[PDB]
Amino acid sequence: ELGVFDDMNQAIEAAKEAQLVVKKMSMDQREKIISAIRKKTIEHAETLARMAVEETGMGNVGHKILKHQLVAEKTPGTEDITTTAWSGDRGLTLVEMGPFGVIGAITPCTNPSETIICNTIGMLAGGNTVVFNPHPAAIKTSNFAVQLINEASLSAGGPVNIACSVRKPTLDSSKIMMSHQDIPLIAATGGPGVVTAVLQSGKRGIGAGAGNPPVLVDETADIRKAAEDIINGCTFDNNLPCIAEKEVVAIDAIANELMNYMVKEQGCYAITKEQQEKLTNLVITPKGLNRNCVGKDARTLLGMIGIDVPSNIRCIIFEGEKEHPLISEELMMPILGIVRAKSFDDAVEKAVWLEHGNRASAHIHSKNVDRITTYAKAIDTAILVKNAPSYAAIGFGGEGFCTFTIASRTGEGLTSASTFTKRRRCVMSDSLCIR
Amino acid sequence: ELGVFDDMNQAIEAAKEAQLVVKKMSMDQREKIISAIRKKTIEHAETLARMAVEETGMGNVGHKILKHQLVAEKTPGTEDITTTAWSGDRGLTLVEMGPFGVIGAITPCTNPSETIICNTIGMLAGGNTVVFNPHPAAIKTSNFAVQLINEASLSAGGPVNIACSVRKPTLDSSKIMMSHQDIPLIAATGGPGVVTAVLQSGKRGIGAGAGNPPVLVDETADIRKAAEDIINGCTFDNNLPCIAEKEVVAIDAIANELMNYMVKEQGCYAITKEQQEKLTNLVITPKGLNRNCVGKDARTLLGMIGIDVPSNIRCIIFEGEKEHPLISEELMMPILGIVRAKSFDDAVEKAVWLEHGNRASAHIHSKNVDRITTYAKAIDTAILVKNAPSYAAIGFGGEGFCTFTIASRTGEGLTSASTFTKRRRCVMSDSLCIR
Amino acid sequence: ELGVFDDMNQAIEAAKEAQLVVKKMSMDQREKIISAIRKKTIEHAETLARMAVEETGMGNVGHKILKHQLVAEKTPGTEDITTTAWSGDRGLTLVEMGPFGVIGAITPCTNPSETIICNTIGMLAGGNTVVFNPHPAAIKTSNFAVQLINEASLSAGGPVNIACSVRKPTLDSSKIMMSHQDIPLIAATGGPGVVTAVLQSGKRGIGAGAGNPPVLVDETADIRKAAEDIINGCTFDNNLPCIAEKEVVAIDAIANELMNYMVKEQGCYAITKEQQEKLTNLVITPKGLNRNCVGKDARTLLGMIGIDVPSNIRCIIFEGEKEHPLISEELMMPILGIVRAKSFDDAVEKAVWLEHGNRASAHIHSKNVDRITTYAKAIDTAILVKNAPSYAAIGFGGEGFCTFTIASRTGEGLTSASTFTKRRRCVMSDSLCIR
Amino acid sequence: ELGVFDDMNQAIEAAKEAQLVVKKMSMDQREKIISAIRKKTIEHAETLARMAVEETGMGNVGHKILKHQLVAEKTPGTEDITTTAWSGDRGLTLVEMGPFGVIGAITPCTNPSETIICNTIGMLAGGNTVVFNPHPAAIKTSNFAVQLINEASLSAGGPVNIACSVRKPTLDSSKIMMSHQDIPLIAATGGPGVVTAVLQSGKRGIGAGAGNPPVLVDETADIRKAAEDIINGCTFDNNLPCIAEKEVVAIDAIANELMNYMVKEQGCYAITKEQQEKLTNLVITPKGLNRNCVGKDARTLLGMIGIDVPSNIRCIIFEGEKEHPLISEELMMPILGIVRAKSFDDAVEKAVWLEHGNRASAHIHSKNVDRITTYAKAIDTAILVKNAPSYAAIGFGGEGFCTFTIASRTGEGLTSASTFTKRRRCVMSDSLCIR
C-alpha cells in the first residue's frame, strides 16, 4: 500500500528522501501536486466518508463528504507561503518561511482523513513532507487517505512518499516518531493525552488540545436563526468536531423562545429529568465516555435508552445547571443542554466555566457590539463565531480558510502551511534598496 | 529587591497577579511602560555592562553598552502586535494576537540583561508578564535588569512585578517553572541542554539553540571591507554573541589578501602551528570548553599561553582545516581560523559542515547574486548576513529589529512581541463588510 | 522669510534642488528632519493656533492647539513607506514606493498650518519635497508653518527648502504650479472649485473634495453618550473641519431624549421657527455662505441675530426637514439641525440625501451590527465613524493615523506618505529566493 | 452585438445599471463571472490573436495567444481586494477598498483585447463596471473581446453589460466619456496624447504613458543568456509591448560577444551604415512613425528596403550612438541598436538619456548587486527586470501578476483590481478589540 510501511523507521526514511526533492521543488510544482490532491479528495470524498463511518461507527456520510469538500476547496496551498521585505539605506532585509523537514503528525478518529489531507496540503506547500501515526480506530480510512495523496503526487510527476504512514499504528510506533532525530516538528491533533506527550518529546510540538465550546444567546439575538444555526452546528457530523457547539447558555428572557424554536423547527427532542438520568448513565460510564455512543445520531442515542422517536429527530436538548454532566462534559454527541442565565454577565461567567480554560472554541449570538466584545475578551478562545454555526470558523459559511488542526494549546491557532515553516532572515547589506 | 523573590512559586504568583492588570491595559499604557524601560536601559547601560563584565569575567563594557542601546532603540514594542481582516459576503473575520499569560524565561550569562530586557519589552507588549530564571553566573546583573524594569513600570504608573526573578537561581527553581501550571510558554535562550529540557516540559518551548556561524568570502567580494566586517563582527563583545562569525571559509585565490588585510589593518595576530597547539590545549580542556577563556579578549588569551602582543591586537587568526578544533568548535573567543577552499562549491560544503546542522547563523561576502542564492539555499539558517558584520542581523547596521532570543531550533526565528502571543480568530458572520 | 519666495517659479526651483538631496537621504535622515518638525510643531502650536484665529477670524485656539498636536503625534512618517516581496522558483520580485519629485499643494484657510505640516511630513517621508500655494486668507499662518519646517530641517542638518511657498498667493501663482513641468502631482485640499481645477491640470491630482457629514442615531444607541459625542464633534474648532458632524438624523422614538440631553448637558440652544429664519437670512446671503459667520462660535452667531445667551452655550440646535438650508448646506458653523425619521430605513435614506453624493464623511451611533453594516454599505463614504465623535476618524480617540488631506473625490482616502509615492516593481529573475 | 452600443451615452447608462448589481454581488459571484472570463479568454485566444493581426496588421498570432493566456492565468481577481485592521483600546478601525462605479477606459491597438480583458477582470473584481472606447484600428478585435466578456457573464448567471463599448469609436465618443458625470475614473492605456487628455478631464485619470526601455549589459552578465533574453524580449509580438527592450547599452569589453551571440544563435541580422539609413528613411517619415512598419517582423522590414534574408531572421541589430533615431525613438519594431559604453557609469548615463525621463520600463543584465542597485536607483522606472526578458515584468517567467495597464505617469504602477477602488476607513470606537 502506497506511502504505508511496516514500521515507523521505514516511514520516516521514505519521507525524508521525498523531502529532499520537495524542498527543491518550485511553488508551481508543489501547487500541481496540491491541485491533484484537492481533485483526488473531491472524487473520493464519498468513499472516504463512508469508510470513516463504517470503520469508526461515528459521524455520518453526508456531513463527512462536505467536510472533505471544505478541505479540498479551502485549505491554504502555496499562496499561504509569504515573504516580508524591509529596505532602506542599510539595504534589503528579507524574511522567508523555509521548510522544517519531515514533520510527524498524530491524527484523530473523528476527522481522520480530513486531518491527514489538510495537514499534507499545508505541509507540502511549505517544502515539508509528513509522516502519520493515525488513530488506530480509523487506520483504514487514514491510510486510504495517505494512499490517495501518493496517487495524486504520482499523477503530477512525483515524488512518491510525500505522505507516509504505518500499516499498524501502536504506542511503540508513536514513541519512535517522537524520539526520531530526523523529525524536528510534530503536529498533534487529538486529546490532551497525546498533545501533552508530544510537548515532552524534545521537539517542537504544535498542540491541538480539546474543548467544550459554549454558545451564548442573548436577548438581542435573532432567536429563530440562533436556533437553526446552533442545532446545525451542534449536530454536524453528529457533534464529532472539536469546534461544534456542545452546550448553550441562554439569557433567561428568550430561553423559552429559543428552545421552543429548537423543538418545533430544528428536530429537537426535549428530555425529562427522568430521561436525563438514564442517558447520563448510558453515555457516562465508570470507564469515562461511552465509545459506543460517541458520534451517534440522536435517534440512535434515544433508542439506546428505549426512547422511540421519529426519524426527523436529530438533537437531544434539555434545560440544566452548568454542572450537569451532559452539559459540563465534552461528549461529541448531538446532546445539547440549555443553561438559563439571569444576565449577560452571569451568562459570560457560566460560559467561561463551561469552556474549562481550554481557550479552544466558543460562540455567541448577539447583535450588540459591546456584548460581543465583552464575551470575546473574557472567553479568549482560539476561535469565536458570532451569529453563525460553529463550522463558519473553518470557512463553511464564514470568511477565512479551512483547517482541521486548531492549535489552541501551543497557540498557533488555525494551522496552515505557514505554521509549519521556519523563519529565515536574510540581510542584504547596503545593496538592493532601489529607491 | 524589586521583582526578585526568595523562590520561584512566589515569583510566578506575583507575575500572574500583575498579568491580570497587563492583559487589560491599553496599547498606550503598555507602550508607556515600555518607553520608560527603553529610557531606563539607556540611562543604566554603563552600569549593566560593567556589571556583566565584572560578574561573569566575560565580554567588554563598550560593546555591552552598544548592545543595550540596540535593545532599547530597536526591540519591537506594541506596533509589533498586529491584526488581519478578511471581509466579504459572509461578513468579517479578524485574527488577533492575544496574550499567553505568564511566560517563563531562561536566560544566558553572555547577554544576560540584554535578553531579559528584550524579552520583557516584547512580552509585555503582547499583554504577558514574564518570570526569569537567570544564569547563575550573571544573577546579579540579571536581577539588576529585573529591578530596573519594575523601577521603569513603577515610574509609569504601575504595575509592579511585570518581570519577576529569583534571588538564587538553581536547577530546582527552573524545574518548578517548567512544571508550573500557571506557565504555558517558556522561552529558552541558552545552550542545547536547557532548550532540550524546556521542550520536554509539557509546555510550548521557544528554543534558541546554539551555532558555529561561518562566514564565506569569495573572489567577487570587496576584500578589504570583508576583512573589516568579519573582525568587527567576530570580536564584538569578545565573540560572546551566538550570531558572531566564529570561523571563515575563503576562496583560495583571495584568501591571502583577506588574511593580509586582517593582520595589517584589523588588529589580527597570526599564530604558528606550534602556537595553535598550546592555545587548543588551553582553551579546550578534558572538561570541555575553558570557562576562564570564554569571552576573553585576544591579548588576554595570547598572554595566557605566554605570548606577549601589542594592545592593538584584538583577534587570533590562522589558516587551518575545518576539523581543527579552534575552527570546528564554538568557542565564544576572538579566535578565528581561515579555511582555504578550491571552489565556491567546495566553500559551500565546508561552510555547511562547520554550521553543524544548527540552521542558526551564517554569513557571506560576495557581490554575486547566484553565489549568495546558492549559499543561502544550502546553508538554510535562521540568519544570513551578506556583505556586513553579523550584528547587522539584529539591526546594528542592517534593516530590521533587534532581538536576543533567536529561536533557531523551534523555528520562530528572531523573536519579538508577536512570537509570544496566541492567535485568535473572530468570525463576524454576515455583518460588518461595509463594501 | 525661509522657504517663502517672491514667485512660484522660484518656489518650484528651490524645491526641485532640495528634492535632489531628499531623494538620496536615508530613512533615518528623513525621520530626523521629520522628528524635528514634530517637535517644532508642538513647541509652536499655541502660536500657530492664535495666528489662524487672528488672521482668518475662524475657529478657536484651544481646539487648534489640539489639532496641531494630533498632526505632530499621529501623522505617519517613514514607517509608512513599505515594501512587498514575492519570491519563488523564478526569483525575487520587489515592489517599492519611490518618490514623485516636487509635489504641488493647495491648502485651505480652515486647517491651514495643520494641512501644510501634515502634507510635508508625509511627502518628505517619501523622498519628495513640496511647494505650497496657501489660501490667501491664511497666508501668514501658512507661511509661518512653512518657515517653521525649514527651521526644523535646518536644525537637523538640512537641507533648506524642503517646503516652499510664495509671499503672495494668487490665481496666477496657482496656475503656474498647475502647468509647471517640474511638478507631476498636486494635492488639492479645498472646495470643489480648486479640486476640479487640479484634475484639469494634465497632472495627477489628489483631490480632497467637500462634504456634509450626517450623523445617524438609532434607538439602540447610548443616547447620553451620543449627545456628548455629536456636540463635541460638531463644535470642534467651531465646525471648520470637513469631517465634523453638520446635521443629525434621529430615529423618532429617541429623538427627544437626544435633543433634551443636548440642551441640558452639552451647551445647546434650541431655536424657534422664527429664530431659524433670521439665522438662515444671516448665514446664507445672496452671495452664498456668509464668510463673516463661517467658523464662529454659537454665542457669537446667536448674538449677531440679537439673541443673547449664556457663555456656556456652544451649539445652535433645532428640529427640521432635511431640505432646511441650515441642514442641507455645509456651513462650517456650530449649527446642528435634527431630522426626525420614521424608521432606520427612512433614516438611512435621509442621511444619504444629506451627504449629497460626496462619499466624504458620515457617522452613526448604533449598537447594532446589522444597522451599522446597512448604513455603511449605503452611505459609502471615505470615512465612517461609529459611536464616537467624528474626529476619531483622524486618530483623536480612534485607532489609525492622522491626516488633513482626505482624498474623497479621487479615492485615495486618508492621505499619508505612501499616497505620495510611485510604485516600482523590481524583478530579480531566477535568483535571491533563499528557500 | 453584446455590450456594444450605437453611442457612448447608451454604453455608459447600460454600464451604470449593471454596476448597481455588481456592487452588491458577493466576492464569490464576481469570482465566478471572472473565472468564466478567464476560461472564455483561453478558449478564444486563437481567434482574438488572429483578429488583431488581421485587423491591425501588427504583431503575430503565436505571441498574441500567449499574451491572452498570461492575462487569463495571472491577472489578479478578487483575492486582490484586501482589508486592513487596527485594533486597540479605542476599538477597531477597518480600511476597505470600495468600488468607484462606472470606470471609463481607453485602450490601444497593440494589445487591444488583452487590455480590455485585463482591465475588466480587475475592475469587476472591485465592484466596478467599465466602458471602453477602443482604438479605432482594433475596434473589431476590441468589441469581440467585449462581447466575449458579456458571453462569459451571461454564462455565470449575469448580469449583462459589465463591459460596454461603442460600435464606432471616435474622438466625439471619447470626449463624451471624459465629460460624463456618471464616470469618476478613467484608465488611459495609450500614448501621451490620450493620457494627457484624460488628466485634463476633471476626473481622476490613471495614466499609462509611453517609454523606450533600455537594457543594460555589463561584463558580469551571463552573455549568452543575455543575448537570448534580450532578443526574445525585444521580438515578442514584434516589439509591440510597451515594456519590451527597444535598445541595448553594452559595456564595451563584452559588446562583441553579446552581438556575436545575437547573430549566431538568436536570428539577428546586422545592418551596415548604408542599410541603416534606408531603414531610418523607411520607418521614420516626415509624418513621424511609419504605421505600415509598426509591429512588423524583421524579415518583412528588411524586405521592404529590398534586403532579402532567411526566414530564420527575427531581429535587425546594429551598433550606433544613442542619438541614432532607430535607437533613440520608440519604434515598436524588432529593430535593436547596441550602444557601446566605456564604463558602467557611462552605461548608466546613456541608458538614462535613452529612457527619456519616462520612468516606464528598463532592464539590466548583471550578476553584481551594487551594479543593479546603482542602475535601479538612477533609472527609477515603474519596472525593472534583472537578468530576464522584459515580459518577466508581467509574470511571464517572473514572480508577480500580469497587467497590461502600467500606470507609469500617474504612479500606480502595474494596475490591478486594487488600483480601481476607493479607500474607506471605518472606525468602530471602543468596541470589537477582542484582545
Numbering used by the authors:
A (entry chain A), B (entry chain A), C (entry chain A), D (entry chain A): 28 to 462
Paper text:
Here, we study the kinetics and substrate specificity of an AldDH enzyme from the Clostridium phytofermentans fucose/rhamnose utilisation BMC, Cphy1178. The overall structure corresponds to other members in the aldehyde dehydrogenase family, with a catalytic domain (residues 238–427, highlighted pink), a cofactor-binding domain with the Rossman-fold type nucleotide binding architecture (residues 28–108, 127–237, and 428–447, highlighted grey), and an oligomerisation domain (residues 109–126 and 448–462, highlighted green). The catalytic and nucleotide binding domains come together to form an extended nucleotide and ligand-binding tunnel that is open at both ends, with the catalytic cysteine (C269) at the centre of the tunnel and the NAD+ cofactor binding at one side. Cphy1178 forms a tetrameric quaternary structure generated by crystal symmetry, with molecules related by D2 symmetry.
The structures of Cphy1178 were also solved with mutations in active site residues, C269A with bound CoA (1.77 Å resolution) and H387A (2.08 Å resolution) to ensure that mutation of these residues did not destabilise the structure of the protein. Both of these proteins display essentially identical structures to the wild-type protein. Mutagenesis of a strictly conserved Histidine residue (H387), that is within 2.5 Å of the catalytic cysteine completely abolishes activity of the enzyme. This residue is not found in any of the non-acylating aldehyde dehydrogenase enzymes. The proximity of this residue to the catalytic cysteine is incompatible with the formation of the correct geometry for deprotonation of water for resolution of the acyl-intermediate to produce a carboxylic acid product. In light of our biochemical data showing that the H387A mutant is inactive, we suggest that this residue acts as a base to activate the catalytic cysteine and to stabilise the acyl-transfer intermediate between the enzyme and CoA cofactor. In our reaction scheme H387 deprotonates the catalytic cysteine to allow nucleophilic attack on the substrate to form tetrahedral intermediate.
